[PDB]
Amino acid sequence: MKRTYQPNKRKRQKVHGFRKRMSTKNGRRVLASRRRKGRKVISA
Amino acid sequence: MELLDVIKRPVITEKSMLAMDEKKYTFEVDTRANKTLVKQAVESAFDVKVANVNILNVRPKFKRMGKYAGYTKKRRKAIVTLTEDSKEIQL
Amino acid sequence: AIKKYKPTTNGRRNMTSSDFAEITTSTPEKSLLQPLKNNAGRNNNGRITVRHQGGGHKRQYRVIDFKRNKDNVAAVVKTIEYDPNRSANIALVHYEDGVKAYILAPKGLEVGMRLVSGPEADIKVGNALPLENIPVGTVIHNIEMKPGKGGQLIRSAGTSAQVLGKEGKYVLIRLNSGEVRMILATCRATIGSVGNEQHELINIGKAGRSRWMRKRPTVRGSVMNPNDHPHGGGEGKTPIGRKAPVSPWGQPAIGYKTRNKKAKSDKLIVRRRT
RNA sequence: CCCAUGUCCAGGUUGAAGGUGCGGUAAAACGCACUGGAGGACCGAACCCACGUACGUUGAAAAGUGCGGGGAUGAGGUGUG
RNA sequence: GUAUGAGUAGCGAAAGACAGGUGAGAAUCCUGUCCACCGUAUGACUAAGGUUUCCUGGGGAAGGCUCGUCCGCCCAGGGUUAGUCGGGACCUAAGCCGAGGCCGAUAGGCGUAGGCGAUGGACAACAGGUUGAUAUUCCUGUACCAGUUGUUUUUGUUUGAGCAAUGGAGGGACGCAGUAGGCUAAGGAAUGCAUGCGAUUGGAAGUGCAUGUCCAAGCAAUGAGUCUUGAGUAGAGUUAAAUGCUUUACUCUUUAAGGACAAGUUGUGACGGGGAGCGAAAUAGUAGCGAAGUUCCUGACGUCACACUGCCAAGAAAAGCUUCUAGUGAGAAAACAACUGCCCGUACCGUAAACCGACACAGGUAGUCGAGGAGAGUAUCCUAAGGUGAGCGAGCGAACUCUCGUUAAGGAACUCGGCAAAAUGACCCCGUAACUUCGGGAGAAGGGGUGCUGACUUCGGUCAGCCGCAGUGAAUAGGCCCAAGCGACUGUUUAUCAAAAACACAGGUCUCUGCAAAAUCGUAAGAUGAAGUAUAGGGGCUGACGCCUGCCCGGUGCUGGAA
RNA sequence: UGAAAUUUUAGUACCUGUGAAGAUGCAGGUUACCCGCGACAGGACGGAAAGACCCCAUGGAGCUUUACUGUAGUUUGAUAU
Ligand SMILES: [K+]
Ligand SMILES: [K+]
Ligand SMILES: [K+]
Ligand SMILES: [K+]
Ligand SMILES: [K+]
Ligand SMILES: [K+]
Ligand SMILES: [K+]
Ligand SMILES: [K+]
Ligand SMILES: [K+]
Ligand SMILES: [K+]
Ligand SMILES: [K+]
Ligand SMILES: [K+]
Ligand SMILES: [K+]
Ligand SMILES: [K+]
Ligand SMILES: [K+]
Ligand SMILES: [K+]
Ligand SMILES: [K+]
Ligand SMILES: [K+]
Ligand SMILES: [K+]
Ligand SMILES: [K+]
Ligand SMILES: [K+]
Ligand SMILES: [K+]
Ligand SMILES: [K+]
Ligand SMILES: [K+]
Ligand SMILES: [K+]
Ligand SMILES: [K+]
Ligand SMILES: [K+]
Ligand SMILES: [K+]
Ligand SMILES: [K+]
Ligand SMILES: [K+]
Ligand SMILES: [K+]
Ligand SMILES: [K+]
Ligand SMILES: [K+]
Ligand SMILES: [K+]
Ligand SMILES: [K+]
Ligand SMILES: [K+]
Ligand SMILES: [K+]
Ligand SMILES: [K+]
Ligand SMILES: [Mg+2]
Ligand SMILES: [Mg+2]
Ligand SMILES: [Mg+2]
Ligand SMILES: [Mg+2]
Ligand SMILES: [Mg+2]
Ligand SMILES: [Mg+2]
Ligand SMILES: [Mg+2]
Ligand SMILES: [Mg+2]
Ligand SMILES: [Mg+2]
Ligand SMILES: [Mg+2]
Ligand SMILES: [Mg+2]
Ligand SMILES: [Mg+2]
Ligand SMILES: [Mg+2]
Ligand SMILES: [Mg+2]
Ligand SMILES: [Mg+2]
Ligand SMILES: [Mg+2]
Ligand SMILES: [Mg+2]
Ligand SMILES: [Mg+2]
Ligand SMILES: [Mg+2]
Ligand SMILES: [Mg+2]
Ligand SMILES: [Mg+2]
Ligand SMILES: [Mg+2]
Ligand SMILES: [Mg+2]
Ligand SMILES: [Mg+2]
Ligand SMILES: [Mg+2]
Ligand SMILES: [Mg+2]
Ligand SMILES: [Mg+2]
Ligand SMILES: [Mg+2]
Ligand SMILES: [Mg+2]
Ligand SMILES: [Mg+2]
Ligand SMILES: [Mg+2]
Ligand SMILES: [Mg+2]
Ligand SMILES: [Mg+2]
Ligand SMILES: [Mg+2]
Ligand SMILES: [Mg+2]
Ligand SMILES: [Mg+2]
Ligand SMILES: [Mg+2]
Ligand SMILES: [Mg+2]
Ligand SMILES: [Mg+2]
Ligand SMILES: [Mg+2]
Ligand SMILES: [Mg+2]
Ligand SMILES: [Mg+2]
Ligand SMILES: [Mg+2]
Ligand SMILES: [Mg+2]
Ligand SMILES: [Mg+2]
């Protein structure tokens, strides 16, 4: 029974990282929304 | 950074005292200081001659008081070995 | 020739392959090798655009000289080599000036032949000449459609075309498909026919061999679901159950022509076939 | 599913093509030995899989375990990106 | 928020016993002894992941399915040392970003140059010791790599040593399978060597018992072997040039010669270190001391080395590196001495109680090492090194349920169905049918042998004898046959009720497609098809192979025609 | 050491009958001292899941086609370039 979550530092950053979010207009929209909501952590 | 700002404080512990017996002294240094800069700063400050400098990064350590939890500040530790025929650092 | 394996195993049963007798070496030319990746039928969007492709053995690209535009000096045929990229074999040839190149190996080519290219080259297997210089009735291959572009037509193993005549600035040609068309007289071609004629007769023998050759399984539309293929669905085996069989995207699959009706090349195609 | 680049498959068994020798013939085909080591080949661990059954079924487990079961140099398993 | 069920289910695979100690309190914590368990692992390393869980000293609120004096918990201190290891200051693959550029209601999409990007290439250090916690990082010893300064020694200074391209080249540079050979680890035996001991339960001072039985990198010398023809002439090229490289003809050489590689061995590294064991106080088995380190047997797909052979499915790139000139050039080279060498990771767990599973969860987790007897073996049983006794127990030994052993006579009468279980099972020998695509069927079937002790063996046997109910005496190992349907076959499939006759398949056939091909993704640009070209590519159907595949073109499609 | 599903309150018998037509609870009669423990599963139309069968809603979704109406594409003409 291999489960869905297989941790990996590099993959987390490459997929959900701050620079990845900033590379795309929609990723920047996510960052804006997180800031507006006030999330302490806006990116992985 | 200023040479005087490079070295922050000595480290006094069982391990560091044993090191002193071998004529190597442990100092907390600015986290951005490379061991070459550390060597220059030690020489200017203490007039001794440095044989080698071994540097290592101490990770921030998790702590908690009551309802609050955080991390101690990260540190940078440098073990400086003086040459023979050199004055000792007096603390 | 074709060697038939003894039926030692059901997989090996009925299998045949080539003996590679013509092949003289197995060490390609380092200078002419190029890297190739297996696109596996996926385009820049990453979507599968051509089904049933992918996997299989790794290959290196051999830079073939389809242009044959080096007319100054003669090229001596050094070796006949297997080419993983094409059905036909290739020939490594050394030009007397020291330039190494690969060409298609015509039927009857042999090590030591001194090929030449240019208008004055004699009509010998492996020579290259502009179509205007090739006498009628000659059998040729590696025909180029535009001058200087390099041979494009008649390159598969065992294929060949025949020169039928001249007219205006064009040359009448019967292609391997039986289609007769005009081709610009300044286009070049190689005298002869592409070697390795036996290629067609190989019996692959087992599924794993197709997988080696980079063919992934083909699934019949009749055994898909309705949302997958127009033939999909129905209880049990079903007939086509439509006006005509169609591709996965509804294009009729039997007899329905697809050539563009306003093709510019109709003016040059004299007699069609296929 | 695919791409690039790595990596894994204890140990046994069988004996294809080809080759050599001797027969045989005008030359052959062909025959007999030896050699040779092919295979989605055979048996079988690791590995992968999941056919039968019992149990489990507020479980040890939101799909498993026990006993057996199939594949195991390939259309193979698997890692990293 | 609190009840009921209820002091009920459950307390999550397995062996512990006792003595002593600690302490308010002990089945559960510590110590000791015996016993037991794993041992191709439940041992030893590592990558990811986790992120302080590591060490030391305290604590017993909560967490731990019981307990707890204890813990991966809580509290306080402490712990990760690199020119050489892995990464960066090196290279590139897939893929990604992308100056200009192309395309596009907006947003943006695509892409050249150029970059990024290891899982690959390149690249200089090892042995021992030391701490409670780090070690190829610290220390001792002995090195190497890049560079700076300086001393000395040679040689060159513009008829110019030397350096040297972003340029020309070479090289890097590569698959799979198959055995064979060399070498070394590894393993085993010895009345080899060294040390220690002589047993009390009847016997043994000997061929008794136990334990050990060797050491780098670097440097030097060599080396099992492995690959490879080597010159010369005349040309032609290599955007300029070249002595380099590529190459065409022509001579001579080719059992060789020359050249390029090479595991490993010997010496030194070593007056060093380890090492059975002996063993100190002032408080341990710890300072410290410390013998021997032979021969023989087996012997690695570990290494030479993808070396050789064979095969088809035809098996990265770039840099480093080596050469060539072009350019650049007044300084160079050697030895020696001293000196310089940055950032990041380094703790600990890691077939797990520390990772993925909500749990201290019978699941999952890449790679390396992985011993002995019997054995083909990493199977199997019992063991070595090493690790562990599983975080509720004490009784009792009812039904019933589960897991397992045995079972008179019968032997499928059970049942939807021989489901389950039983039976067969290893090796050696004899022997083996229909049918067949000649390969198989086939381990068909059906039989026989297996222990121990002598003798002789051509070393595999044979002959003789002995014992038992039984000799692959345990463990681990096919049940078989006749016949029919379906599917040719190996494969694939509904993760988690269906593994099949379903899908695929090789083969067949039809049809499209002349290349800016057809087809497909996309508004487009741009892509795949394909750096392919009708013996190719796409689509439909059928589905090995063998024998065959009849009649109908009126209707519907397609194709052609054009009055 | 210590849950859970369930649970209107319950001092919670049997027969025949009655009743929304299948009663522990209603009628007549019978039986039965109070409280438990170990077992079994006939009943509580037992628990679990606002039945998936069936029907209905001018509900939903996926699919088909010579259903209706559109439409991407493909093609043909005019016209501009
Ligand atoms: K948050
Ligand atoms: K076959
Ligand atoms: K080919
Ligand atoms: K098919
Ligand atoms: K169907
Ligand atoms: K099972
Ligand atoms: K409760
Ligand atoms: K209760
Ligand atoms: K404690
Ligand atoms: K490093
Ligand atoms: K790497
Ligand atoms: K040079
Ligand atoms: K070394
Ligand atoms: K040595
Ligand atoms: K470390
Ligand atoms: K053995
Ligand atoms: K073993
Ligand atoms: K316990
Ligand atoms: K009892
Ligand atoms: K029972
Ligand atoms: K019976
Ligand atoms: K049979
Ligand atoms: K017997
Ligand atoms: K067996
Ligand atoms: K089938
Ligand atoms: K089939
Ligand atoms: K059939
Ligand atoms: K099956
Ligand atoms: K299927
Ligand atoms: K057929
Ligand atoms: K077809
Ligand atoms: K059909
Ligand atoms: K087919
Ligand atoms: K008809
Ligand atoms: K018709
Ligand atoms: K009612
Ligand atoms: K009941
Ligand atoms: K639905
Ligand atoms: Mg460091
Ligand atoms: Mg296809
Ligand atoms: Mg279906
Ligand atoms: Mg449809
Ligand atoms: Mg249908
Ligand atoms: Mg039907
Ligand atoms: Mg097989
Ligand atoms: Mg696994
Ligand atoms: Mg599966
Ligand atoms: Mg099988
Ligand atoms: Mg098998
Ligand atoms: Mg109860
Ligand atoms: Mg337990
Ligand atoms: Mg085992
Ligand atoms: Mg601890
Ligand atoms: Mg503690
Ligand atoms: Mg407790
Ligand atoms: Mg490195
Ligand atoms: Mg882009
Ligand atoms: Mg731009
Ligand atoms: Mg290195
Ligand atoms: Mg440690
Ligand atoms: Mg005695
Ligand atoms: Mg030039
Ligand atoms: Mg070997
Ligand atoms: Mg460590
Ligand atoms: Mg676990
Ligand atoms: Mg055991
Ligand atoms: Mg019986
Ligand atoms: Mg009996
Ligand atoms: Mg019966
Ligand atoms: Mg019966
Ligand atoms: Mg059975
Ligand atoms: Mg046995
Ligand atoms: Mg089948
Ligand atoms: Mg199968
Ligand atoms: Mg299923
Ligand atoms: Mg199943
Ligand atoms: Mg079919
Ligand atoms: Mg009534
Ligand atoms: Mg009633
Ligand atoms: Mg009442
Ligand atoms: Mg009621
Ligand atoms: Mg109910
Ligand atoms: Mg309802």
Residue numbers in the entry:
A (entry chain 6): 1 to 44
B (entry chain W): 1 to 91
C (entry chain G): 2 to 275
Article passage:
PoxtA and OptrA are ATP binding cassette (ABC) proteins of the F subtype (ABCF). They confer resistance to oxazolidinone and phenicol antibiotics, such as linezolid and chloramphenicol, which stall translating ribosomes when certain amino acids are present at a defined position in the nascent polypeptide chain. ARE–ABCFs are comprised of two ABC nucleotide-binding domains (NBD1 and NBD2) that are separated by a helical linker termed an ARD (antibiotic-resistance domain), and, depending on the species, ARE–ABCFs may also have an additional “Arm” subdomain inserted within NBD1 as well as a C-terminal extension (CTE). Cryo-EM structures of PoxtA on the ribosome reveal that it binds in the E-site and, despite the short ARD, still induces a distortion of the P-site tRNA, leading to retraction of its CCA-end from the PTC.
Further subsorting of ribosomal particles using a mask focused on the intersubunit space yielded four defined classes, which we refer to as states I–IV. States I and II contained density for PoxtA bound in the E-site and tRNA in the P site, and had average resolutions of 2.9 and 3.0 Å, respectively. Additional density located between NBD1 and NBD2 of PoxtA was attributed to two ATP molecules (ATP-1 and ATP-2) and a likely magnesium ion, as expected from the use of the ATPase-deficient PoxtA-EQ2 variant. As observed for other ribosome-bound ARE–ABCF structures, the NBDs of PoxtA adopt a closed conformation, which is also consistent with the inability to hydrolyse ATP. In states I and II, which contain PoxtA, but lack A-site tRNA, some density for the fMet moiety on the distorted P-site tRNA is evident but is poorly resolved. While the ASL remains fixed in position on the SSU where it decodes the P-site codon of the mRNA, the elbow region shifts towards the E-site by ~6–7 Å, thus bringing it into contact with NBD2 of PoxtA. As a consequence, the single-stranded CCA-3ʹ end of the P-site tRNA becomes contorted in the presence of PoxtA and the canonical interactions of the C75 and C74 of a P-site tRNA with 23S nucleotides G2251 and G2252, respectively, of the P-loop (H80) are disrupted. This results in a shift in register such that C75 basepairs with G2252 and C74 stacks upon Gln282 of PoxtA and interacts with G2253 and C2254.
